């Protein structure tokens, strides 16, 4: 069925980097034309900013520009999120999203709460 596997909480040191393991699944009925668009969000409920966007990065918020990267393989269903140069401001929740088709998109509500420490 549809879903995403990632840790619920993750902690990193300011200045360092953080890697969030992530894997997603979708029904074998599966369509294959959308090229699967992966998108990570930050503060989905509040300001909801884009951390990455396989579609077009021009949609990525200036806050995460060049400070985040998708370490995955759609062909393996890997969505790992790499955070470069951590800062305290990076603390918060991250949620993944992927789209195979217009009416076949999914968002992980669990997300991953990232808290940057010293």
């Amino acid at each position: 069925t549809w879903g995403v596997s990632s840790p619920k909480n993750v902690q990193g040191l300011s200045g360092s980097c953080l890697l969030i393991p992530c894997i997603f699944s979708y029904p074998a009925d599966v369509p294959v034309s959308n090229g699967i668009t992966a998108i990570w969000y930050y503060d989905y409920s509040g300001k909801r900013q884009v951390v990455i966007h396989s579609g077009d990065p021009k949609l990525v918020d200036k806050r995460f520009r060049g400070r985040a990267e998708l370490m995955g393989n759609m062909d393996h269903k890997v969505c790992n999120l790499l955070l470069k140069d951590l800062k305290p401001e990076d603390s918060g929740t991250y949620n993944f999203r992927f789209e195979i088709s217009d009416s076949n998109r999914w968002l992980d509500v669990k997300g991953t709460t990232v808290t940057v420490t010293t």
């Binding site: 989905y44 409920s45 909801r48 998109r105 968002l107």
Partner: peptide
């Protein structure tokens, strides 16, 4: 888009 809104 839909579902969650916003």
């Amino acid at each position: 888009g839909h579902t969650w809104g916003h």
